[PDB]
């Protein structure tokens, strides 16, 4: 157990702030809600504060707080994300969309007061203007995934590897290959994990009285051991 884990005991407010620029189409997203790490549960509504989101909402789910993952008792000694709190961690990804562009993201995840804040910069390049992403051809849904986590001893953080398959409106799938690196912001000790999985489940919806372009997300995330965590 870490000291940082103690910050997660009950329900914690979350603020997510994302500035994006994909093929020169700029946007901002703000997320508001709460996290319950005991149960591995997140409740968030995200609004595009610049008006129309120029990419599909499902392509931003992974970018838009793994510190709310439920680590079973016997895996708590492997929970990097909470151990890095309150000072927090940097999270970087390259997300490669098969036969289309790439997103590069850099986020800082830390507490500000009693709120957990995820502040992200996203830059996408090499997208097709007519493709599945800039052409909004993806279905509004998000399937369950398995994130593979490994220690990065030299950086005293973690790497993660996973694939997201987004359903396309014509019945095809759009792959998005995720490469991820996390490093702590503070100088204090953290917990480095053995290899494991995070098992994820996500429900996307709309708030019927919300006029702005938005996404309501319910997410469940639980850590799982190495033998069966792939499915
Ligand atoms: Cl969408």
Author numbering: 1 to 64, 68 to 234
The publication says:
Recently, we applied Cellular High-throughput Encapsulation, Solubilisation and Screening (CHESS)-based directed evolution to superfolder GFP (sfGFP) and identified a GFP variant, termed ultra-stable GFP (usGFP), with superior stability when subjected to SDS and high temperatures.
A point mutation at this interface was introduced to generate a monomeric ultra-stable GFP (muGFP) variant. The crystallographic interface between these two molecules was altered in muGFP compared with usGFP, and generation of symmetry mates within the lattice failed to provide any crystal contacts that resembled the usGFP dimer interface. This suggested that the F223D mutation sufficiently disrupted the dimeric interface observed in usGFP. Examination of L69 in muGFP showed that this residue had a similar orientation to L69 of usGFP. Importantly, the water molecule observed near Q69 in sfGFP was also absent in muGFP. Y164 of muGFP also showed an altered rotamer with respect to Y164 of usGFP, and did not form hydrogen bonds with K166 and D180, but rather, a hydrogen bond was formed between K166 and D180. muGFP Y182 formed a hydrogen bond with K162, which was not observed in usGFP. The absence of concentration dependent increase in the weight average sedimentation coefficient indicates the absence of self-association of muGFP in this concentration range and suggests that the F223D mutation was sufficient to prevent dimer formation.
